């Protein structure tokens, strides 16, 4: 029962070269490990790229090769290109055992990075006389597609009744998400100001409203 | 070209067993090994088996013993995998995927196959207008809360407006999921002018068309 691990994220741009690496918790990974590499799309959709540590898989370009490094496997994107950001996983044969990693999510910027544009609603007077109020928190055309959200109500920090959405593709290829709090309909009134706030790279964008 | 083609979505109640289907094409099927692996949401990946049509021989990942089974049909170049007394933790993408022996690794792989066991009923959505707190442009929505199982789907005058609208990704709260989905407009053309979503969750056969109205 070998452990692989590998790099959890890893960004690229365009034309460049980005390596990414496997581990073995049993040791020095070896030819005998015989070390896959093989390639997740969106709609998980898998293809092979590399088997026996460096043999390239059949339709497979040539930008793509294995190797090993130092007491690693290594898989090498050389010229990287916008259709090669996907979630890569390694596979080790180990103990009679094919053991895969937990997979590198590699961003290639193919587009200029984009702050979110946040709006904020407030529960509507129909919801609120079932004794509910959920806010909606909007965010759109974001690049890349990370994002962290956080709610205040009357400056301090809420987390119950919040849910998130994870990051889709728009039209415009940016990025989209939403965020989700609920309460009682009696608890939101129990508050003044509502805010939501959106972190992307480092940078916070945010959205206020009063109940009143 | 070699491809391999596997049964569509699954939806099981716990307890059920369910029999996933990979039909390979373009190569010689008896002649390869077929690999089996289970992709669970925050679990990365983990090997099941494998089974070699030409011989029937099978090679299982001891964990999966008494959970899978390997069948294969050289007549129809077909290799299935039977999934018993389903729980929460079978619920995944399970793919198939082609061992070649002097690549020592897999190459060609299904496209997946996504199994729900879950004992979760249909359940109807609710929707609610989303208008501004009462700039050039304004931006209105429709929240579609506490329904199963996916989708729905929204459109916005009855189609007539397509562009700037954004149907976000539905989440789940309380067991149950939420969606939301805006338009952006120009700030003459409403409350100028009528903005209507138009609901709809084929699952419970439930449509519903609501007009978003100033504050």
């Known amino acids: 029962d070998a452990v692989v691990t590998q790099e959890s994220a890893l960004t690229t741009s365009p034309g460049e070269t980005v390596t990414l690496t496997c581990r073995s918790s049993?040791?020095?990974?070896?030819?005998?490990?015989?070390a896959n590499w093989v390639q997740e799309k969106p709609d998980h959709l898998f293809t092979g790229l590399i088997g026996?540590?460096?043999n390239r898989a059949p339709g497979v370009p040539a930008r793509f090769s294995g190797s090993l490094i130092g007491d690693k496997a290594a898989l090498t994107i050389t010229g990287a290109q916008t259709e090669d950001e996907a979630i890569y996983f390694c596979?080790?044969?180990?103990?009679?055992?094919?053991?895969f990693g937990g997979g590198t999510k590699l961003t290639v910027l193919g587009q200029p990075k984009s702050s979110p544009t946040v709006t904020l609603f407030p529960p509507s007077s129909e919801e609120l006389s079932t004794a509910k109020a959920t806010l909606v928190c909007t965010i759109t055309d974001f690049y890349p597609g990370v994002v962290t959200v956080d709610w205040k109500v009357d400056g301090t920090p809420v987390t119950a009744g919040m849910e998130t959405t994870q990051p889709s593709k728009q039209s415009n290829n940016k990025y989209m998400a939403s965020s989700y709090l609920t309460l009682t309909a009696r608890a939101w009134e129990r508050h003044s100001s509502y805010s939501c706030q959106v972190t992307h790279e480092g940078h916070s964008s945010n959205k206020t409203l009063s109940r009143a | 070209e070699v491809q391999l083609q596997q049964s569509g979505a699954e939806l099981m109640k716990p307890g059920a067993s369910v029999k996933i289907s990979c039909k390979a094409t373009?190569?010689?099927?008896?002649?390869?090994?077929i690999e089996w692996v289970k992709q669970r949401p925050g679990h990365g990946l983990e090997w099941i088996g494998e089974?070699?049509?030409?011989?029937?021989?099978?090679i299982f990942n001891e964990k999966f013993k008494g959970k899978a089974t390997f069948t294969a049909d050289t007549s129809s170049n077909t290799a299935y995998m039977q999934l018993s007394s389903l729980t929460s933790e079978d619920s995944a993408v399970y793919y198939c995927?082609?061992?070649?022996?002097?690549?020592?690794?897999?190459?060609?792989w299904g496209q997946g196959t996504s199994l729900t066991v879950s004992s979760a009923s249909t359940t109807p959505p609710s929707v609610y207008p989303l208008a501004p707190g009462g700039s050039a442009m304004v931006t209105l929505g429709c929240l579609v809360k506490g329904y199963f199982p996916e989708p729905v789907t929204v459109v916005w005058n009855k189609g007539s407006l397509s562009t700037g609208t954004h149907t976000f990704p539905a989440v789940l709260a309380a067991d149950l999921y939420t969606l939301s989905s805006s338009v952006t407009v120009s700030a003459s053309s409403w409350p100028g002018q009528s903005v209507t979503c138009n609901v709809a969750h084929p699952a419970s056969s439930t449509k519903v068309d609501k007009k978003i109205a100033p504050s």
């Open positions: 995927a082609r061992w070649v022996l002097d690549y020592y690794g897999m190459d060609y």
């Open positions: 373009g190569y010689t099927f008896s002649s390869y090994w």
């Open positions: 089974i070699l049509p030409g011989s029937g021989d099978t």
């Open positions: 049993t040791g020095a990974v070896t030819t005998s490990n015989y």
């Open positions: 026996g540590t460096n």
């Open positions: 596979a080790l044969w180990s103990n009679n055992k094919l053991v």
